Amino acid sequence: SMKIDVVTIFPEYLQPVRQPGKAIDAGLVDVAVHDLRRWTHDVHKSVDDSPYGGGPGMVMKPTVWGDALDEICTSETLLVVPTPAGYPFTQETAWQWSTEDHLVIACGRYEGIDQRVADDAATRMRVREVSIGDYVLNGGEAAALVIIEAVLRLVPGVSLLEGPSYTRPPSWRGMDVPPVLLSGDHAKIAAWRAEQSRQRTIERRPDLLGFDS
């Protein structure tokens, strides 16, 4: 069983998590979404301020985050902070996190979260700053959705690129399913599929096989 808390200033953006939806329905995992502004005290509910040292944009204040995480996290929590400057989130990471009791995902907006939030949390719990890929999102919420989906499907009770797949009809718009796939010859099918995967990995992801680019 796993508990996931997501903290965000846009809780409505996390609704796609209800599809993970079937997983929540079957009660293996519970996912709860929290509005960060719940932990503000001024009437303007401010969560951001200009950066020390200058630069464009705003930084999320540590005070509000600290109060939220104080309430939501325990010492057993794995605190996950999406950020383009994070360690890479990979399938290995997803396997690792799949056996955790409690994930808390802190979703940043603006130019990021004051670094002391993660630093303070790390004195009490395990903290993981991670990137889901080399592109810029408008905030951590889409990353949270990717992480949740990748992790939940590995929870107990829920190399080379995959080649092309085919299903019926065997001829469509004058394009035939590769004949070997209709042959029923398991050895020849396995071989053809390995060759397809090789071509595809070399072409699209040569890095996976230890080649440049």
DSSP 113: B
Structure tokens belonging to residue 94: 């997803």
Question: Closest approach of Cβ 179 to ligand JAW, in Å?
Answer: 27
Considering the complex, state which of residue 43 and residue 85 has its C-beta at the smaller distance from ligand JAW: 85
Side chain identity at residue 141, one-letter code: E
Q: How many C-beta atoms surround the C-beta of residue 187 within 10 A?
A: 7
Using CB under 8 A as the binding rule, whether residue 163 contacts a copy of itself is answered as yes
Binding mask 135-164 for ligand JAW (x = CB under 6 A): xxx-xx--x---------------------
Number of residues that bind ligand JAW (CB under 6 A): 13
Q: Among residues 205, 207, 132, 134, which one has the least CA distance to residue 163?
A: 205
Q: For the chain, where are the E strands, in sequence order? A: 2-8, 29-35, 48-49, 59-60, 78-88, 102-106, 126-131, 171-172, 175-176
**Residue from the set 54, 75, 157, 187 that interacts with a copy of itself by CB under 8 A:** 54
Please give the Cα distance from 51 to 67 (Å, whole number): 20
Site membership for a copy of itself, residue 14 (CB under 8 A):
yes
Residue 8 lies near ligand JAW (rule: CB under 6 A): no
* Binding flags for ligand JAW, 120-139, as an x/- string (CB under 6 A): -----------xxx-xxx-x
Q: Which stretch binds a copy of itself (CB under 8 A): 25-33, 36-44, 73-81, 87-95?
A: 87-95
